[PDB]
Design a protein around this ligand. Structure first.
Ligand SMILES: CN[C@@H]1[C@@H](O)[C@@H](O[C@@H]2[C@@H](O)[C@H](O[C@H]3O[C@H]([C@@H](C)O)[C@@H](O)[C@H](O)[C@H]3N)[C@@H](N)C[C@H]2N)OC[C@]1(C)O
Lengths: 108, 63, 386, 172
RNA sequence: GCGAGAGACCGAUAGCGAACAAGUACAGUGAUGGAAAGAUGAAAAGAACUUUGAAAAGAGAGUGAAAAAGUACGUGAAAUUGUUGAAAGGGAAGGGCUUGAGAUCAGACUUGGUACCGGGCCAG
RNA sequence: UGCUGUAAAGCUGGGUCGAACGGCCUCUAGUGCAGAUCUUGGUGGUAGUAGCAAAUAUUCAAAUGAGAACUUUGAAGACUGA
RNA sequence: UAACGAGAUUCCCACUGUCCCUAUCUACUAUCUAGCGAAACCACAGCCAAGGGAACGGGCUUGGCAGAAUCAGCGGGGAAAG
């Protein structure tokens, strides 16, 4: 068990926003990434970087990209009496292409 | 913690709309102390309050 | 007053109530009538609906305009890996109906059929049939006595068989267990046949031959809550009707002062239990055969599967039954195949069918090729081919 | 102040009250009945899981035309619901009663909810506006809540006597 | 109008509309229309202090003859409601008559007479 | 809790309560309610029900605070479009 | 009687889901949840068939029968409400 760990993932947002109301697409991508981070990190305390919010909304309310490359880090939430000893911080990763990328453990 | 008055005074002092006033996020306490127009001018001079630039409307396509 | 004009009733009163079926596995309400002189044989088989395809055939019906000409026909593919016999049940005649006297199980049960006795398999100790298997260990005299009971008292003998669902592309791991009645011979012959087949596999070809007319029992596609217009096919009210038009305008006269059971109402549509009869067997395919889709007239070395796989099912890699037309149910649905309940001597019942060709173009779009080789030949080399 | 029910041994009991609480009477009655007679810690954990939508409050009397849920199967019902405001008020009152019991030297682990009831408080009036220039009532239905925590010859005829004497003599 | 004395009168939905900051609050452009609302306690002695809580409050404590008088205050009915205890329940419930069962109430051993006399009740 | 009366009603045990009230002979009346779409006040079932859907649309982070979908600041995405 | 007409009427061309004969799609509801939370109406109430009866009964007579608690819909009845 490595509580503190950072990995880079690709999320398929196109299949997660299928049929979604056009004025809820970018807000739902926020919720989808939070659910994505809990699935991989096991924490309901998920925090999104403001730069990730800017990337999600870059092309308006329904302009979300099909695939986004994300860096997710599990970090200790000492902050006693917080209902979660750990939390997930999600930030964007700038790449030339969003295809062909696999899950990679990030060393620091 | 409530800088509504400061936003309004800064807009009046600088000569722009409220939409073009930038109150420093990291200097909340000092701005909250600025109750007069004189204190607002001091903050404006020292860069704690900044006039944002205009949204560009280029006429290049029109020309 | 009388209806101003006469029209037939909308929908059938014989399929009421239009409720959801009690179980998803369609049950055989009645089995073929037992003929003692026949060989001992099964009367039903369980498979999985995989999809539909197209065939070409020469018609053999003298006097028809299409006699000795090719017809194009829709067909259904049923994935039917062999079933495993795991038990036997004996039934006695009573003045209150058939009553099951006892049930005898095989010594060993596979995990897939034992998964059928659990709602939470992974949290359990897997104790199912663990004390029963000790009834064989000492000398199996208890099993012998129960089988002797069945021979002495039962008048109807049915076997307990389950599917091998792990041979299908289904993600479900529970096997479907069903009773199939044993017909032919004496009750003693039936019990002997069941005992010798304990823990053993039985294939479709030992039940259904090609050109046979068979029945299908399944649960139909669900539609949830439906209004009267589609549930019963009643006439739409005019465009200018206040409060809507997908309705029945009059649901009854003043008297009787109650809504009658014969009036169409909104309610759940589909997911009903149906017994459809007289589906001709065009093919009993073999899983080992790599020319399942091939014919004597089309010799391409071809499996029954279409290009890309059956949509939302996968590939049929076992024995299969090719049936004329359509059958109740959806893709992935377990379907029960039953022998005909009567003897049919019409020309369509006794016709020998000879398949010219089976379509294996993609079901995922307007597929224009039957094989990857044909696609490559037509298109030549592509950028990804290098 | 007079409570509706008084404990048998006041030295082993603690009580709490809330009056004129602006919380639904019907939801509060259901939530109070959901934990009546429970161990204090069991009840507190259950209320936390209710606030998490992991378990539900069974609605037994004030439940007409409410929704159905599979979380009612725990209590043998189909109509159950998750009233957050009532749960928060009951939790606050349970915490206060627990503090009182601690101040009286009582053991928290042995405490049981031996009495809890909800009564109607006076209604608070507001107004709502209807079609054709009409005014209707738009009232609140407040609650009074109280709870208490507690640590967990034969005489015979002449003939009957004669019969018994004869029988005793007959058997030794 | 001003000053007095009275009643087989009314007793807070009564008596004047008004026993109260009543021709008040409020409505209508206006002429006009026009309410509701009396009582802790002898005395505020109107609850210091400790404690839980963000607070409102609660629990202790205290004052008082009484808090079953806490400025939601004399008494505090009914409709209606909660909890507790007992009981009953196959498309209403309720009622009369009758008895059973369970509960409650009542009486002659008398205002009994000097171990006996004598009496009460139910029965053969 | 019982007792009396065919009845209208009368008396009594227990609880609550705090300042007046009753029997008898007579006098007198603004003297007895289930109804009047009665009057005034109060309270139910309905019912946690109908419903809280026009005017394009919100999101991330920080601050504050016991508590933040709704406050403030920053960053965006939008709209009114003279 | 030229011209004019959100006036009444007939035919024709064009047009089309008005229709044969319906199907599919979108937003907002309905739905379920947190919070908030009315009203109409209400003798008592609420399963049928026949009978008689103020001559068309939920109750009465004679039969059929009859099992808690319920959710979404619905427009036969309550000679439903106003
Ligand atoms: C606190 N609320 C105030 C208050 O002054 C209120 O007073 C009543 C008072 O009149 C009552 O007292 C009452 O006493 C008798 C008897 C029937 O009780 C009545 O006949 C009498 O009118 C009245 N004084 C009292 N029991 C409760 C207070 N809230 O009266 C007006 C009000 C605005 O509601």
């Amino acid at each position: 068990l490595q509580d503190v760990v950072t990995r880079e993932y690709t999320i398929n947002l196109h299949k997660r926003l299928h049929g979604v109301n056009f004025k809820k697409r970018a807000p739902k991508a926020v919720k989808e990434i939070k659910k994505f981070a809990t699935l991989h990190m096991g924490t309901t305390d998920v925090r999104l970087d403001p730069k990730l919010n800017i990337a999600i909304w870059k092309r308006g309310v329904q302009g979300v990209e099909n695939r986004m490359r994300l860096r997710i880090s599990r970090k200790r939430n000492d902050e006693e009496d917080a209902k979660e000893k750990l939390f997930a911080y999600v930030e964007p990763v700038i790449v030339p292409s969003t295809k062909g990328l696999q899950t990679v453990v990030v060393e620091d | 913690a409530n800088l509504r008055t400061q936003k309004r005074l800064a807009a009046s002092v600088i000569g722009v709309g409220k939409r073009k006033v930038w109150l420093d996020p990291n200097e909340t306490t000092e701005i909250a102390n600025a109750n007069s127009r004189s204190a607002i001018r001091k903050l404006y001079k020292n860069g704690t309050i900044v006039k944002k630039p205009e949204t560009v409307h280029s006429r290049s396509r029109a020309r | 007053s009388h209806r101003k004009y006469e029209a037939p009733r909308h929908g059938s009163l014989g399929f009421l109530p239009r409720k959801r079926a009690a179980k998803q596995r369609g049950r055989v309400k009645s089995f073929p009538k037992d003929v003692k002189s026949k060989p001992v044989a099964l009367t039903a088989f369980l498979g999985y609906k995989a999809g539909m395809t197209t065939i070409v055939r020469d018609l053999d019906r003298p006097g028809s305009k299409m006699h000795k000409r090719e017809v194009v026909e829709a067909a259904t593919v049923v994935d039917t890996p062999p079933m495993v016999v795991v038990g036997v049940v004996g039934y006695v005649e009573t003045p209150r109906g058939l009553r099951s006297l006892t049930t005898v199980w095989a010594e060993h049960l596979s995990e897939e059929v034992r998964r059928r006795f659990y709602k939470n398999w992974y949290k359990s100790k897997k104790k199912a049939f663990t004390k029963y298997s000790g009834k064989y260990a000492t000398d199996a005299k208890q099993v012998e006595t129960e089988l002797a009971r069945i021979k002495k008292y039962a008048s109807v003998v049915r076997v307990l068989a389950h599917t091998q669902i792990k041979k299908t592309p289904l993600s479900q791991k529970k096997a479907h267990l069903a009773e199939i009645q044993i017909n032919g011979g004496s009750v003693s012959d039936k019990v002997d046949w069941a005992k010798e087949h304990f823990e053993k596999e039985v294939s479709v070809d030992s039940v259904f031959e090609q050109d046979e007319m068979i029945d299908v029992i399944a649960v139909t596609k669900g539609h949830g809550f439906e209004g009267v217009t589609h549930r019963w096919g009643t006439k739409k009210l005019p465009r200018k009707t206040h409060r809507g038009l997908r309705k029945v305008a009059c649901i009854g006269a003043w008297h009787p002062a109650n809504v009658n059971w014969t009036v169409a109402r909104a309610g759940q549509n589909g997911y009903h239990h149906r017994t459809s009869i007289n589906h001709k067997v065009y093919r009993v395919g073999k899983g080992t055969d790599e020319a399942n889709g091939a014919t004597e007239f089309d010799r391409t070395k071809k499996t029954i599967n279409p290009m890309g796989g059956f949509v939302r099912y996968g590939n049929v890699n076992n024995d299969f039954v090719l049936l004329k037309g359509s059958i109740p149910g959806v893709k992935k649905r377990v379907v029960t195949l039953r022998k005909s309940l009567y003897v049919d001597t019409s020309r369509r019942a006794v016709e020998k069918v000879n398949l010219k060709w089976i379509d294996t173009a993609s079901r995922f779009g307007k597929g224009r090729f039957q094989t990857p080789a044909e696609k490559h030949a037509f298109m030549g080399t592509l950028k990804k081919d290098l | 102040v007079r409570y509706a029910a008084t404990p048998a041994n006041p030295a082993k009991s603690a009580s709490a009250r809330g009056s004129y609480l602006r919380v639904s009477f019907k939801n509060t009655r259901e939530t109070a009945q959901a934990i009546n007679g429970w161990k204090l810690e069991k009840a507190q954990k259950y209320l936390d899981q209710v606030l998490d939508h992991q378990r539900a409050i069974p609605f037994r009397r004030y439940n007409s035309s409410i929704g159905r849920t599979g979380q009612g199967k725990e209590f043998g019902v189909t109509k159950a619901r998750w009233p957050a405001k009532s749960v928060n008020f009951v939790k606050d009152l349970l915490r206060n009663a627990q503090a009182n019991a601690e101040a009286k030297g009582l053991d928290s682990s042995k405490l049981v909810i031996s009495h809890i009831q909800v009564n109607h408080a006076p209604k608070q009036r507001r107004r709502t506006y209807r079609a054709h220039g009409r005014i209707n009532a738009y009232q609140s239905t407040p609650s009074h809540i109280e709870l208490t925590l507690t640590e967990e010859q034969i005489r015979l005829n002449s003939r009957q006597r004669g019969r018994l004497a004869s029988q005793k003599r007959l058997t030794a």
